[PDB]
């Protein structure tokens, strides 16, 4: 499902992703945003190394969910990652949580570095009474 801005902003707040290891709301919104489009079955194949990145927060299935034909897979949220492309973004959360558990936090999404990191990130979230 494509979620509309504020609509995203409450989910994530109802799922306790506000302030989570530090993080505001702001910037997961600006990280989902250049993402996904806030879109929960996006999919990009990464040709280089064999492996794929699902969902809203574009979680790479290397490290973090199974897809079972990436090599190396690791699976630290021990998730499959057809489970991050549900409309249903609970399971993303959790595992996007795992993620930012690891001493980068955020920083580990590259596109987070790009476009969110040392910019006014409050747009994302304004007018959403969050």
Excluded at 13 to 18: F, S, T, V
Excluded at 21 to 26: D, E, Y
Excluded at 75 to 102: E, M, P, Y
Aim: aromatic letters at 10%; a positive charge; one cysteine or more.
């Amino acid at each position: 499902k494509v979620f509309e801005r504020c609509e995203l902003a409450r989910t994530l707040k109802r799922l306790g992703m506000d302030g989570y290891r530090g993080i505001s709301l702001a910037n997961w919104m600006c990280l989902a945003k250049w993402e996904s489009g806030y879109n929960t079955r996006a999919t990009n194949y990464n040709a280089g190394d064999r492996s794929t990145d699902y969902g809203i927060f574009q979680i790479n299935s290397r490290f973090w969910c199974n897809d079972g034909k990436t090599p190396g897979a690791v699976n630290a949220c021990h998730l499959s990652c057809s489970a991050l492309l549900q409309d249903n973004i609970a399971d993303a959360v959790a595992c996007a949580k795992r993620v930012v558990r690891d001493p980068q936090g955020i920083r580990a999404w590259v596109a987070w570095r790009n476009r969110c990191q040392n910019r006014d990130v409050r747009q994302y979230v304004q007018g959403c009474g969050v």
